[PDB]
Each structure stands twice: as C-alpha cells, then as structure tokens.
C-alpha cells in the first residue's frame, strides 16, 4: 500500500490513493491526503476517524476530531458530530459543557445513551435529567432510586412503567410509616400481595381488604384477613365473607 | 481397560499412565492430575486438592494429610466427584448432588442436598469454575443433559433429540462432558451416534444455551478429556494429547492473558449473536 499510494499521487487519478486509504480504514492517513486531493471530505473522514478513535478508546482525539469533522450544510451529520463531542466532554470531566451540548440536540437516543454514560460517572442528578428529557421516565426513576431521591420517583411515577421500581418505593415508603403511597405503589407493581397486607396492618380496613380480593383474587392475606378479624360471635359471616 | 484420563490446570493424564503438562510442555482404576500432585484411585472417586486429599467414604466425604475435614451425607454413595475453580460438586447415582466451596480453608456446602428425580441414575457429573452450574440423566447414558441453577434454584433440561431447553443432534446421545477451566460459562459435550461429535455451549443466564461450537471428534482422538484455553485437549489414539485451538481461537494461541479474555468475550457475544460486543471486545485486538 506504501508503493500503491506513491504511485497513486504520481499518477492522473490522484484521489485514487484516498480512497485506498479510506478503503484501508487508515483514517489519519486519509486526512494527512485529503488537505491537498479533497478538502471537502475533510470533515467526514475526521468524524470516522474520531469514530474509531471512541472505539479505541482514545477519547481524548475523539473529542477534537468530532469538532473538526463539523459542516455548515449536512445537518444529520453535524447532528452527529455535536452528540459525539457531547459524549467525549461528558466523558473529559467537562460535565458541564457535555450536558449543555447534550440539552441542546434534537435526538432522543443521545439522551438515553448519555444516561448510560452519566450511569457510569454515576451522577444520578445529570442522568435523571437526561433520561427524563426525552422519554426515559423508568430509567430516571431507577436512577433516582440510586440517589434516593423519593419526590422526584414519585412525580415520575405517573409515568414510571416499571413495577420494580415502584415495589422498591414501596418498600422505602413502609420504612416511612406512611403505608398510602407504598399502597398505591404496590398496586401499580401488581403487589397486592402487599396491599392487602397494608389493609390488614396498617389500614385496618377489612371491607376494602375483601373488595381488593374479590376484585384481583388476594391470596396471602386472604385467609390472614379472616383470622384476625374472626374474633366476634358473628364474625364467622366475616371467615365466609372472605369465601372461605 | 477403561482407560481413565482426566485433564485438569493444564495437566493431561491418561492411564497407561502418560502425564503431560501442557503449560510446561513437559510429558512424562482412575487417576486425577493437578500441577503439582497426581492421585491414583477404597472409594470410586478420589483427587488431590493441593495437598487435600478427597476421601469418599459411605455416605460421607473426608479430608487427611498426604483425618483434616469431615462432610456427612444424610442419600445415595457419592460416587462423581469433580473440581473445578473453587467449587465441588459431590453427587451420586441417586439422583442427587451438593456443591461444596473451597474458596475457604475447608469445604463448605455452598448448596443444600437435591433431588434431580423431583426435577426430572446419573452418568457423570461435573462443575464450572465459579461453581454456580452443576449432569446426564439415565445404565446406558440418555440423550437430555440437566444443569442445576444453584443461585436461582431451578433446573434446565436439554433435549438433544429435540433440541429444546425445559426450564424447571437429534440421533446422539451425550456420553462424557467437562468445562473449560477459566470460563465457568463454558461447557462442553461428547456425543456418540445411537458418529462422535465434540458440541461445546455456552451458558448465559440472561439468554439461556447457545450453540457455541459443534465439530466431529478428531481421527486422532477417541475421547473428550477437556479444554484449557486456547485449546480442546483429547485422547489421542496411540504425546498421547491432542490439542487442537479453538476455531475463532485460531491465530491467538501465543498473545497474552487479556487478549484472549477479549476474544473469548467475542466468542461468546457471537454465540449470544451480540455482534456489537464482539466487535467491542475485538476493537483492541
């Protein structure tokens, strides 16, 4: 290829030997060309370059040739190369900066990696934000948890799709006392193995104890229910009030 | 005779009774090899575990010098005994098993006694170095292969007729196994037609069973003694090994400890059909 390429520039096809040398993966050397034969592919081939570059690990030149691969016309790629200096000054220590360039870029996807990133610097704050700006309620509730954050999982939790998360503030909530918001939670965790625990605790409720499992079919604290509450002449009404 | 071989830390013993130590390239009922003491075997299975010895008595398992350790069985003669990183696995022909540690000075059950009749005689059994995995059913050997989940307590069967995986290759039957003795995800089959065909898997537990390789035994080996990384080591038939380097593995035998993690990795997200971490783990490579 050394050869290929000395004659390539001697010859009348000159761009030939880029190509090779894009063809070849041999980024830098394509750039080191492309000053001279095509200055227009300067910022792409950089931005590949920068790619392998991040694949490499070395992010510290991936950082400067994403913002040297920048354009004024392609506007999918500048896109991408703004998401990609986001991510390398996300992963500099350059937080502040990473997530300004992180705010502003039209892209859902760059939210929900840059979350994972900010997951491994492990700054719940900034991958919450990130994770709720687009649509990733779930995982910014996660994260919250992470940071115990409980206000912030509970405004998410509207949206929160994901019972685990709400079992896990249920379980946070009863370490509170409170036992209303870990019921709620644990209904939306399809826990009323818990609810109707709540109901026969806490609550002391043993009608709606046997709505809740007449309505979703309790079993744990069904015949649980009827024991302790069967402490009346009449109350056998109560152990056939719960079926049997 | 049987001819009980047995490889184990890169040491490879055939009863004869050839022992070559691979790492070193140095050659020299049933025997066990390890780097430094090799045990020959009243029990039906007895090995050397540094200088402990793995007495199997009736019903019950001891430790001595070359009386230190006593472990009861409350459940069949344990007669399958297998080690591999820190991790036993003591089972019978009853249909039951224990996995004992020795990360400690002294074995520990890490698992209670199990019924594998409740689950689903045993052929063999054997064990991953993490000892998290622990078996063919049957006194001819059967076709399904079960591994007992230690940490999520269950069982997985594999059909090889139907090539299905019960949560708890169609004309061969599985007639030895082993693991690779770095990756505790890594297991390995021998399979005789009801000819003999090597089918190594990998076990992931967030994907269950891959088919990681699957090749026709070597004309120069007749039986599976086991892997050591890069290499599948046989039996040869009359060096009495036979190594042969993994078929990804090809290239990669002479690189260091982390280059080989790497592409291990890439075997095994290949099996997964991870095509982006392979990729990731190659990228330095």
Request: glycine share 4%.
């Amino acid at each position: 290829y050394n050869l290929a390429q000395d004659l390539y520039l001697a010859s009348s096809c000159p761009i030939a030997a880029l190509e090779m040398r894009r063809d070849l993966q041999h980024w830098d050397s394509a750039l080191q060309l492309a000053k001279h034969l095509a200055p227009d592919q300067i910022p792409f081939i950089s931005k590949e370059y920068a790619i392998q570059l991040e694949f490499a690990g070395d992010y510290v030149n991936a950082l400067a040739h994403y913002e040297k691969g920048i354009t004024g016309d392609n506007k999918e790629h500048d896109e991408a190369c703004l998401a990609g200096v986001a991510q390398m000054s996300i992963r500099m220590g350059d937080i502040r900066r990473g997530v300004n360039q992180a705010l502003k870029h039209p892209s859902r996807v760059l939210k929900r990696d840059c979350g994972a990133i900010l997951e491994n610097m492990k700054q719940f704050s900034e991958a919450a934000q990130l994770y709720e700006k687009g649509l990733y309620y779930d995982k910014a509730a996660s994260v919250y948890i992470r940071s115990k954050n409980w206000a912030k999982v509970g405004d998410l939790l509207p949206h929160v799709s994901s019972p685990k998360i709400h079992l896990q503030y249920a379980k946070a909530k009863e370490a509170d006392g409170r036992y209303k918001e870990a019921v709620v939670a644990y209904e939306n965790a399809k826990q009323w193995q818990s609810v109707i625990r709540i109901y026969l605790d806490h609550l002391n409720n043993p009608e709606k104890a046997v709505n809740i499992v007449r309505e979703t079919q309790s079993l744990d604290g069904a015949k649980m229910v009827a024991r302790f509450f069967l402490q009346l002449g009449d109350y056998g009404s109560a152990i056939q009030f719960l079926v049997m | 005779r049987a001819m009980s071989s047995h490889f184990h830390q890169q040491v490879a013993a055939m009863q004869v009774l050839n022992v070559c130590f691979l790492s070193t390239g140095v050659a020299h009922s049933g025997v066990f090899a390890t780097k430094d003491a090799v045990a020959v075997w009243e029990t039906p299975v007895l090995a050397m575990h540094e200088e402990n010895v793995y007495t199997v008595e009736s019903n019950r398992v001891q430790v001595r010098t070359w009386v230190k350790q006593l472990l009861l069985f409350s459940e069949g003669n344990p007669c399958f005994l297998d080690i591999c990183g820190n991790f036993l696995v003591v089972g019978t022909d009853l249909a039951h098993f224990k996995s004992f540690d020795l990360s400690r000075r002294e074995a520990k059950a890490h698992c209670s006694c199990r019924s594998l009749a409740e689950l689903v005689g045993i052929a063999s059994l054997r064990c991953s170095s993490s000892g998290s995995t622990i078996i063919l059913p049957s006194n001819s050997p059967d076709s399904k292969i079960c591994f007992y989940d230690v940490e999520m307590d269950t069982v997985t069967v594999f059909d090889f007729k139907t090539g299905q995986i019960d949560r708890r290759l169609k004309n061969y039957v599985p007639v030895n196994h082993f693991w690779d003795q770095s990756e505790p995800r890594l297991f390995v089959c021998e399979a005789v037609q009801e000819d003999v065909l090597i089918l190594s898997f990998f076990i992931s537990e967030e994907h269950g069973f891959l088919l990681h390789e699957s090749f026709p035994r070597p004309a120069t080996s007749h039986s599976l003694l086991g892997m050591e990384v890069p290499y599948y080591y046989f039996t040869r038939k009359p060096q009495m090994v036979s190594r042969r380097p993994l078929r990804d593995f090809v290239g990669l035998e002479d690189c260091d400890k982390a280059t080989r993690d790497a592409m291990l990795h890439f075997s095994f997200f290949v099996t997964i059909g991870d095509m982006d971490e392979a990729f990731k783990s190659i990228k330095l490579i």
